[PDB]
Amino acid sequence: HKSEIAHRFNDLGEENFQGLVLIAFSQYLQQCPFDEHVKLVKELTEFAKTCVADESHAGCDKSLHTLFGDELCKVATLRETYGDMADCCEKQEPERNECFLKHKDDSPDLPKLKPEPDTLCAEFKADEKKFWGKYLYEVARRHPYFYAPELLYYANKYNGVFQECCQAEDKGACLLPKIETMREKVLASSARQRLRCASIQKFGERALKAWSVARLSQKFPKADFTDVTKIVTDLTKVHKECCHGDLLECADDRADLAKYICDHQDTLSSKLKECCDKPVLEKSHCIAEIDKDAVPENLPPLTADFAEDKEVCKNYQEAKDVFLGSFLYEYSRRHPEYAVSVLLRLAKEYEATLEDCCAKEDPHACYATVFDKLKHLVDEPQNLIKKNCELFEKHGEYGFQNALIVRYTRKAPQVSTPTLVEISRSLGKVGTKCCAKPESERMPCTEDYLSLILNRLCVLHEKTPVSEKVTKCCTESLVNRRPCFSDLTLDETYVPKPFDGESFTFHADICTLPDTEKQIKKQTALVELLKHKPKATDEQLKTVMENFVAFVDKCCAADDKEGCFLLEGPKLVASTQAALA
Ligand code: PRO
Ligand code: PRO
């Protein structure tokens, strides 16, 4: 189209248009305040509108990378706030856009948000619009790769929370669960996009194509390899656009593809029609989290075409990727009960087998027992799952998190305490999310969550790396990632660097803090505990813990509280090191 900025503006409409641009500024300039971004955003909103009314106008044919970038440039505090990011502005497109993206901070250390029901309802009634885009600021800046069309849907679900709720009699009781459920779903969607972008970047497009193949085949097991491949081809393009910070394109192509899929409903899945009349964003979200359709009844056994045919090697040498793309679709549309990562890992084994049989005298011999060999690859990861859930059953989440602290602290004690804690506290939650569903959802569940939390870890680590073992697992095949991390053992090499003089001691804030912060506080002790003596007994650990709990209990029940903590504090530091040797 002859003016892009305005091509897009009619394409999306003033609201989602302004959404998207604010998301783009807030992911560029994570540290600039929200009124700053509110301005940069109406200037390009005005200018856009101009290119709607006089398309030949001065500057309308420009690209968005020059248009956006042109405004990052009139943010005078780029040195102060982002260092050499202001050097970015000096450069020409496409380098200035190359450079701005570098400065994306995956771990921005801004204040966690404590939702206060009366302040938020007051903010909401006072300014609906500013409230909405405030939610877009907050999430987007803490989550610089958040899926932009998806963000806009959640801002919409968010404000509609403050719509149902601020009204009601007990405001808090109405708000607080709903915004907490929504907060979990948001974080989840944030990790999954973050997984996509780090796949595109550390591992090549194709690698991501496999994921969308097996996952999309599981959802629409009644559609073509052709058809599937077609969507996966537009999906990949959307997803690429976002991660590159081309949000407008992104949402627009996600719009088209959703049209497209809703157009081909029966060819794909009975389920689509539910989704197919909701407006663009509720439509796009519904389709993406859409239910697994059921496999058609009379499909032939995988064994014919991949294990008994005698043209299996020939096929496999003429068109490897195709044959293995087709195996992946074929295997996938058939086992909705398997973790996407597991399938790929099955795909890979199948491959390495053919790579070995197809060179024998009798390949058909060597390879006709493949699917059996593959049925057993699933049962060991199942082993871990179930063991990890029992552990969670007998201990409950907080207990289970503390076991994961212990384990993983030992694996990688050079990793930072915040990271071991966040990572360990989320591995705890998977216990809650998954352990209870019927197994036909369980394994996908657990492995879904695993992949997102490991990829979280990997993204923090590559920012400031401190474990070779860690960098390895992060940096080989995604498909081997949980394996590698599950196989890690204590760094028999790590020194108990003392972390001494700097000591970890409590104060009376723990009395007042919401239950999770107390946990974080305690867990950070657990970690630093282990960092200082990596060999320490399970029971050793367990008694030391039983004491902090005694210690805070006594001290949160005293009338003067910090006074207690300043008094009996030292004696826990003595009590503990002798416990330790
Ligand atoms: O929220 C809205 O709908 C207004 C109109 C477009 C930009 N903001
Ligand atoms: O997209 C992929 O290929 C990786 C491997 C399994 C999990 N996801």
Which H/E stretch holds residue 238?
A: helix 225-243
CA distance linking residue 172 with residue 156, whole number of Å: 20
Answer yes or no: do 239 and 280 share one domain. Answer: yes
How far is ligand 1, taken at its centre, from the CA of residue 18, in Å?
A: 7
- Whether the CB-CB separation of 66 and 93 falls below 8 Å is answered with yes
Please indicate, yes or no, if residue 579 is contained in any of the structural domains. Answer: no
**Taking Cα atoms as reference points, which of 64, 124, 53 lies closest to residue 97?**
64
Answer yes or no: do 517 and 465 share one domain. Answer: no
- Whether the CB-CB separation of 333 and 217 falls below 8 Å is answered with yes
Please indicate, yes or no, if residue 158 is contained in any of the structural domains. Answer: yes
Residue 61, CA distances (Å) to 97, 258, 423 in order: 18, 28, 46
- Whether the CB-CB separation of 261 and 233 falls below 8 Å is answered with no
Indicate if ligand 1 lies below 6 Å from the C-beta of 18: yes
Residue 109: which residues within 8 A CB-CB, separation 6 or more? none
Please indicate, yes or no, if residue 153 is contained in any of the structural domains. Answer: yes
Q: Which SS3 state, helix, strand or coil, does residue 326 take?
A: helix
Ligand 1: which atom is nearest the Cα of residue 18? 7
Answer yes or no: do 540 and 510 share one domain. Answer: yes
Answer yes or no: do 111 and 82 share one domain. Answer: no
User: Binding site annotation covers 349?
Assistant: no
Answer yes or no: do 43 and 88 share one domain. Answer: yes
Please indicate, yes or no, if residue 286 is contained in any of the structural domains. Answer: yes
- Whether the CB-CB separation of 324 and 315 falls below 8 Å is answered with no
Answer yes or no: do 90 and 22 share one domain. Answer: yes
Considering every ligand atom, which ligand is closest to the CA of 483? 2
Answer yes or no: do 306 and 214 share one domain. Answer: no
Residue whose CA is closest, atom 2 of ligand 2?
A: 211
Residue whose CA is closest, atom 1 of ligand 1?
A: 15
Answer yes or no: do 278 and 368 share one domain. Answer: no
- Tell which of 194, 215, 238 closes a domain: 194
**Number of residues in the chain:** 581
DSSP category for residue 92: P
Start-to-end Cα distance in the chain: 73
CA distance linking residue 183 with residue 230, whole number of Å: 33
Q: What share of the chain is helix, strand, coil (3-state, %, to 5)?
A: 75, 0, 25
> Resolution, rounded to a tenth of an Å?
2.5
Residue 412: which residues within 8 A CB-CB, separation 6 or more? 420, 467, 469, 470, 488, 491
Domain that residue 26 falls in? 1-105
CA distance linking residue 528 with residue 403, whole number of Å: 14
How far is ligand 2, taken at its centre, from the CA of residue 215, in Å?
A: 10
Indicate if ligand 2 lies below 6 Å from the C-beta of 357: no
User: Binding site annotation covers 14?
Assistant: no
Please indicate, yes or no, if residue 578 is contained in any of the structural domains. Answer: no
Residue type, 303: T
Indicate if ligand 2 lies below 6 Å from the C-beta of 338: no
Please indicate, yes or no, if residue 574 is contained in any of the structural domains. Answer: no
Answer yes or no: do 485 and 540 share one domain. Answer: no
Ligand 2: which atom is nearest the Cα of residue 199? 1
Residue 569, CA distances (Å) to 513, 551, 559 in order: 19, 8, 16
CA distance linking residue 219 with residue 334, whole number of Å: 10
Burial degree of 471 (CB within 10 A; 0-12, 13-18, 19+): middle
Residue 514: which residues within 8 A CB-CB, separation 6 or more? 114
How far is ligand 2, taken at its centre, from the CA of residue 458, in Å?
A: 15
CA distance linking residue 146 with residue 190, whole number of Å: 5
- Whether the CB-CB separation of 466 and 493 falls below 8 Å is answered with no
Please indicate, yes or no, if residue 111 is contained in any of the structural domains. Answer: yes
CA distance linking residue 499 with residue 512, whole number of Å: 28
Answer yes or no: do 101 and 24 share one domain. Answer: yes
CA distance linking residue 122 with residue 562, whole number of Å: 35
Q: In the Cβ-directed half-sphere of 60, how many Cα atoms lie within 13 Å?
A: 20
Please indicate, yes or no, if residue 555 is contained in any of the structural domains. Answer: yes
Domain count, the chain: 6
Answer yes or no: do 536 and 501 share one domain. Answer: yes
**Taking Cα atoms as reference points, which of 371, 365, 223 lies closest to residue 304?**
371
For residue 334, how many other CB atoms are within 10 A of its CB?
Answer: 18
CATH number at residue 392: 1.10.246.10
By what technique were these coordinates determined? X-ray
- Tell which of 491, 513, 529 closes a domain: 491
Answer yes or no: do 95 and 110 share one domain. Answer: no
Which H/E stretch holds residue 118?
A: helix 117-126
